[model samples]
Target: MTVPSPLADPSIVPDPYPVYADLAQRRPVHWVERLNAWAVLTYADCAAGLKDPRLTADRGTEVLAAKFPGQPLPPDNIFHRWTKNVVMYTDPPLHDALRRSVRAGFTRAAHQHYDQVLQKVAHDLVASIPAGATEIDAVPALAAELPVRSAVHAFGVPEEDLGFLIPRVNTIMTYVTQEIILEKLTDLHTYASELLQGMRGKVLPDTVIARLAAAQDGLTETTPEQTVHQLALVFIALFAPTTPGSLSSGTLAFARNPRQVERFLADQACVDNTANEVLRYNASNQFTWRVAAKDVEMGGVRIEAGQTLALFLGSANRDANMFERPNDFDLDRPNSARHLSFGQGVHACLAAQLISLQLKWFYVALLNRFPGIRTAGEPIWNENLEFRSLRSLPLSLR
Candidate 1:
């Protein structure tokens, strides 16, 4: 049951595919001694686990107990409040309405609105790569900016605020320590609170926050507490690792598989589908954590109540049982849309459509500007187990 090496191991962080393949082949549901958690590797099992209500998302109380075993949580602490109040950590009856309101805000209509804005953002991002530069770090130039800029515009957050927002969010997501989470969460929570209070009683544009505000108010059972937390969720979603990670790794995937990028460049119409294949292959959101609420048998393994499960979305996407030639990155895969990177069921990604739209537009703009773009040097992958993030990508977009 020993994991042998943590997923963040320098050796595996660069390319964990071989390890995933081995584990998946040997035991679809394997135990990891590192975290005393189970790793769900197969497509069917991971998908089922996501939809399985027995695996609860409401882990706030459980998490708090672990943090201060038998001790009370700090009152008015943003990190504690975040763990307890944020829609991401809630489930079922409590999560349903909040999830619905969040989903309602990022619908196709909002996508349509945000979709138009991405082109300008993309163009400016690409154009901002410095005049006549032979090489550029694509992460800041395009990969990061695409989602960050679009999110800032869509959520109606100020561009200048990203300086304070980005690092704090990264800390919260990566979770270096409690001190770090609290330090970051306190300000992030305040940022969202200030934003919410600022927007109150004001005639706002058709922004995502505005739509979410409307949706939350229209729902009869929710409260202002839920609304601010949802707003915070929107902020979290906006800065999520998915888009940036995918874009950066997708660029690298395209670099390694020249023909795939060839097909994408040959017919720009396929950008959307190519985006899916990129998502499928890279699986930016590598794993999702869930706690088993009751005894459940999955993939020939018994998971007892309260056990944590690491549903490897990355492993599932490349599962040979679910994908034909799963190891190979193919743009024309018929079921690429079924990738688990964004998740499924009630807890599916709220900004999926918007993300999809941004991806398409981003590729469109990148390719249009520099069709000859290629990797100038090796890209740096972050030592993160849950997220497949690229820290830097050296590109020869000359």
Candidate 2:
């Protein structure tokens, strides 16, 4: 089934559902010559592929090398360093060891601890929107600010230093070259390691960094430098994309579905499920890649070893086979949590709990404060498809 490559079309960044629906029905697992990877669209395929032992994420180094011909990344390169032991890049025995060192911060106790930060940050940020304001840019005011502040509290990164961190992050976030990104990442890596190490055995804010600093005592398979890489990955990873991205798309969703806002505001229990539905309707992590470790047959297509598979989490969430009337922005979908927005299996996001808490608290605070909130202008999305960020979302409070 030959289909027009919707994934290649840059215009599908916002409202990719129209493209996704057609792609899912026509060619759910088609290999595009441009992508050089089979695009996996169906829910069952994505779900299974995420956990399938045959498909591995341990190809980070291979991917980088292939991208740059003979330009191999050396050991000192933080990008190269991450593939060695970063939990997301490594598989099994090594991944387990790396995950163990930082697992403390993602715990329920840690989440409950961070929940106070979420509630307070979300509430205060909304309250700061002022009394009689008619329209405001929700992107920076609410969507972006909540997550940045929440991460500041969690990672104990000084609010002042964000002046240094966020700008470099902004540049790196662009689809720029490796050297330029590598240069910017060095700035980030230096800042992270210094703070991480300095926080040890001190009376500083007892946060995720503290938890990680303390957890380092139990490291076995991973080295000290690898731990540095792990923290570096966490520092940048903590910022804007996931929470802000979802909140960005969600603010737009809420604007179009005003009644959904009323239903959500009427009940206290809608917090989790509402966030789930928003995530399902507009997932933050659109696509995550996995490479075939061995020859396999999936969706009647032969996947050769070392071949890449791009699993579209956004498309899978809206699959009609798994979700009823998947296009609608229904808050009460009982199985909304089953969505693969956070991916699945061992590589599932460790920040899932944290991101969810941030989303729930922010929604409760934002909507409770501005019950009549609606879109004042069209959503301005970042041109990047991978992150799916909102450049601006004008919102009205009545």
Candidate 3:
């Protein structure tokens, strides 16, 4: 099947679901040579692909050993495995190990401090904006503030230093493309090493950073380095795209559908599912890529080893087969919770619960306190192929 390369062009960024629908309806899995990967657009294929172990994450030495019989591979493979550690990027014992290592740091309390902090921040920010304001950019005053404050608490990044760190972290993650990953990886490694080392004896007791430091004690040999690396990992994973995505989609959805918002206000449980359903509808994280572990056939297509597959999560969640009227934004839908927004399996988002928590409280806090919350202006979207979100969401809240 012939298809447009989602990565080759930026125009499709805002509304790629049509493209996704076109692909999924034809062949569930199709090879896109332009991308040098496979694209999996159907619900069944995506689920199967995620669970298939034959598609190994251990492209370890093979990437480094980058010679295909007689042809040589790309010039750089040194940082190839850097993406391997993150549970989302890989499959296996390594994924298990990494998840286990970070669990305590993110979950130490009986409840998450970041969630509580963000909830409070969300309320305070919305309340700070006196009712009847003509406009406010949700990116800065509202959506963005929550993550910054949350990050301050979560990573112990000094507020005085976000001016320096946020930009650096943003560039390093580049969520849109992998082009600068190697360079960014190296720079982050250097920064983290020095940063982690500088924290020696300077950390407060009982904080996540302090706990991470304590956790590092076991890794005597790789302690500082691993701690630093994980710091960057947590930073990017927790911070990037959320502010923009939440701000953009939050404003667009609420502003576009006041009746739904009104319904949500009337029912608190609706907040949970509304966020989930909107998240499903929003093409944030546009498409997910996974490599075929082995020669496997799904929906009658052969996927050889090393073929990359892109799963359009938003498309799957809105599949006609999955939902009765997939296009409409119905918070009252009987079964919106089954959406694959956070993904499933062992690699599911560690922050999924926290994200849900943040969304619920953010809307509640904003709408409850501001009541005047309305679109300040037109929303701008992130055109990057990797991160699907808004660039800015203008709003006015009294």
Clashing pairs in 2: none
**Candidate 3, 1-398: lDDT as tens digits:** 46655543578777776777776777666666544566677766666666677666555334323322333336454355455445555566667766677665667471366566657766776678866567777776666677776556545655665665677677764533344545666666665566567732244345456566567656523334445556667667666885457545765777777887787888866776867877776756656666666687776877777766666676787787887777777788878777777777877767776676667777888777656567766777765755777777877665
Question: What lDDT tens digits, residue by residue, belong to model 2 across residues 149-174?
Answer: 87777656677677877878777666
> lDDT of candidate 1?
0.75
Give me the runs in candidate 1 sitting further than 4 Å from their true place. 1-10, 60-77, 199-204, 214-217
**Where is model 2 more than 4 Å wrong at Cα?**
1-4, 62-76, 199-204
Write the residue-wise lDDT of candidate 1 on 52-84 in tens digits: 999988765554455445565567766556656
TM-score of 2: 0.94
lDDT of every model, 2 decimals:
0.75, 0.80, 0.64
Q: Candidate 1: give the clashing pairs.
A: none
lDDT of 2 at 7: 90
Order of candidates by lDDT, top first? 2, 1, 3
Candidate 1 C-alpha RMSD relative to the actual structure = 2.8
Candidate 3 least-lDDT 10 residues:
64-73
- Which of candidates 1 and 3 is the stronger one according to TM-score? 1
